[PDB]
C-alpha cells in the first residue's frame, strides 16, 4: 500500500536550521505532489505548501516563504523540508500529505515530525514506581528531556485501564506519571511493571510496582 | 482568494444523536465541474483522516456513519448515528487557489455525570533517597471535563509545587483523567505527617478526598 513514513523527533538549538524527510512506498514517486503541514499543540492546521517532484516546482504559503525550503530525490523517493532560523515558536508537529488526482484529495499522510526548538540539554528520567475490588498502580516519570517518552505496562498486556497523561515542562524538564487499574486478584500475585523508553538518552528502563 | 469559515467551534451531542458541522465559502468551489471541499478527523498524537472527498463522496474504508453534503458556497458534515469513537476534531478543506483549511470543530461526547476515582500515592523510596519526594494523586473516570484539586498537609492547604495534566475524552467511555502531583524536598515531606488531594467536581455536593499519614509503614 501507498505509506509515508517521516523522520524521528527533532531538538535543535535556536538559530538553527533542521532537514526532515517523508519517505514514500507503494507508488511512483514522481506522480504525485507532496505537501506539508505545521500543527502547533491543540491547534489547527496551517499550510506550508507543496513540492512537486516531477519538476522539482514549489509554493509556499506566505507565512513560510523565508522560513521553509521543500525539495525531493526522486531516486529515494523521498521529500524533505529544511526550516531555517529557528526559534521556539517554530516548535510543532509537522505532516507531509500526498494530494491524490482524485478531486485534490489528501488521503495518504505522515505520522508526523514532532520538533523541539530548544537551548535545554537532553536529560534521561528517573523512573519511580507508585505502590498503593480494582487496585490502581502508578508510574512517575520526571526529569526528563526533550519528548518523547514512551510508556507501557507488562509491555502493552495491560494497555485496557491506563492512562499515561501528557507530560508537564518545569524548570526546563518535562515530568509525567501513568496509571493503571488492575483487579485485586491480579495484583501483587502476578508482576505489574511500567517500561519507559527515552529514545533521546537511549533509555529503556522496567520498575516493577512492588508493595511497601 | 477564498475564505472558509467553519462552524461551530465546538459541539456537544449524546451518543446516538446527529452532529452536523458547517463550512462556508466567499465565493463558489464548484464553478469548474465538481464541488473542491473535503472533509477531515482528527484524534490527539494522530495524522488527520480523509471522510469526505469532492463534498458528497465517502471515502474508502470509512462508515457510511458519516455523510457530506452542499454545493457552491454551503457545505455540511453529518455524523449519524455518532459513536464514542466520533470525539475528535473535525476539519473542511478547499485547494484550487490558495490551499485553506478550517478553524475546525471540536467535537465532544455527553454522557452521566461521574465521580472521579481518586487514589493517592506517597513517595516512592527510591525517590527520598534522592532526596525528593513527590506526592501522586489520579482523579480517573470522570464527567463533566471542569474539576477542582486541593491539596492540603496537616489539614491545611499547600499551593507551591503542584503540577496538573488533564487526559483527552476517552474513546471508549466519553469520560475524562485528571493527574495531580505534589513535588517537595524529602527533608520537607519527611517534617509532616498527613497529606490529602480532594476533588471539587459537579456530581457531589462534598469533594471526594483521599488522604494517608506518612507514618503507617
Ligand atoms: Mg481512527
Ligand atoms: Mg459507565
Ligand atoms: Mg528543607
Known amino acids: 500500500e501507498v505509506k509515508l513514513q517521516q523522520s524521528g523527533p527533532e531538538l535543535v538549538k535556536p538559530g538553527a536550521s533542521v532537514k526532515m524527510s517523508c519517505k514514500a512506498s507503494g507508488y511512483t514517486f514522481t506522480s504525485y505532489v507532496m505537501h506539508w503541514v505545521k500543527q502547533k499543540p491543540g491547534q489547527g492546521l496551517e499550510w506550508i505548501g507543496y513540492?512537486?517532484?516531477?519538476?522539482?516546482?514549489?509554493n509556499y504559503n506566505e507565512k513560510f516563504k523565508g522560513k521553509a525550503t521543500l525539495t525531493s530525490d526522486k531516486s529515494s523517493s523521498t521529500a524533505y523540508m529544511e526550516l531555517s532560523s529557528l526559534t521556539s515558536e517554530d516548535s510543532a508537529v509537522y505532516y507531509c500529505?500526498?494530494?491524490?488526482?482524485?478531486?485534490?484529495?489528501?488521503?495518504?499522510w505522515g505520522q508526523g515530525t514532532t520538533l523541539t526548538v530548544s537551548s535545554a540539554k537532553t536529560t534521561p528520567p528517573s523512573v519511580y514506581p507508585l505502590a498503593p475490588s480494582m487496585v490502581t498502580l502508578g508510574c512517575l516519570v520526571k526529569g526528563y528531556f526533550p519528548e518523547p517518552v514512551t510508556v507501557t505496562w507488562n509491555s502493552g498486556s495491560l494497555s485496557s485501564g491506563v492512562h499515561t497523561f501528557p507530560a508537564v515542562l518545569q524548570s526546563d524538564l518535562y515530568t509525567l506519571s501513568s496509571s493503571v487499574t488492575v483487579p485485586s486478584s491480579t495484583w501483587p500475585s502476578e508482576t505489574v511493571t511500567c517500561n519507559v523508553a527515552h529514545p533521546a538518552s537511549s533509555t529503556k528502563v522496567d520498575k516493577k510496582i512492588v508493595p511497601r | 482568494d477564498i475564505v472558509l469559515t467553519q462552524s461551530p467551534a465546538s459541539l456537544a451531542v449524546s451518543l446516538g444523536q446527529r452532529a452536523t458541522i458547517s463550512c462556508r465559502a466567499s465565493?463558489?468551489?464548484?464553478?469548474?465541474?465538481?464541488?473542491?471541499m473535503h472533509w477531515y478527523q482528527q484524534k490527539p498524537g494522530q495524522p488527520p483522516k480523509l471522510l469526505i472527498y469532492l463534498a458528497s463522496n465517502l471515502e474508502s474504508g470509512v462508515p457510511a456513519r458519516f455523510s457530506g453534503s452542499g454545493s457552491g458556497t454551503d457545505f455540511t458534515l453529518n455524523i449519524h448515528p455518532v459513536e464514542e469513537e466520533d470525539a475528535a476534531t473535525y476539519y473542511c478543506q478547499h485547494s484550487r487557489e490558495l490551499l485553506t483549511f478550517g478553524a475546525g470543530t471540536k467535537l465532544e461526547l455527553k454522557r452521566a455525570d461521574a465521580a472521579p476515582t481518586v487514589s493517592i500515592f506517597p513517595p516512592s523510596s527510591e525517590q527520598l533517597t534522592s532526596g525528593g519526594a513527590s506526592v501522586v494523586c489520579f482523579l480517573n473516570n470522570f464527567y463533566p471535563k471542569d474539576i477542582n484539586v486541593k491539596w492540603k498537609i496537616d489539614g491545611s492547604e499547600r499551593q507551591n509545587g503542584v503540577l496538573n495534566s488533564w487526559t483527552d475524552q476517552d474513546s471508549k467511555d466519553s469520560t475524562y483523567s485528571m493527574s495531580s502531583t505534589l513535588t517537595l524536598t524529602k527533608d520537607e515531606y519527611e517534617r509532616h505527617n498527613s497529606y490529602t488531594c480532594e476533588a471539587t467536581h459537579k456530581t457531589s455536593t462534598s469533594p471526594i478526598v483521599k488522604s494517608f499519614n506518612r507514618n503507617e509503614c
Open positions: 465565493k463558489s468551489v464548484s464553478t469548474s465541474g465538481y464541488s473542491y
Open positions: 500529505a500526498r494530494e491524490d488526482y482524485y478531486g485534490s484529495r489528501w488521503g495518504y
Open positions: 513540492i512537486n517532484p516531477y519538476n522539482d516546482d514549489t
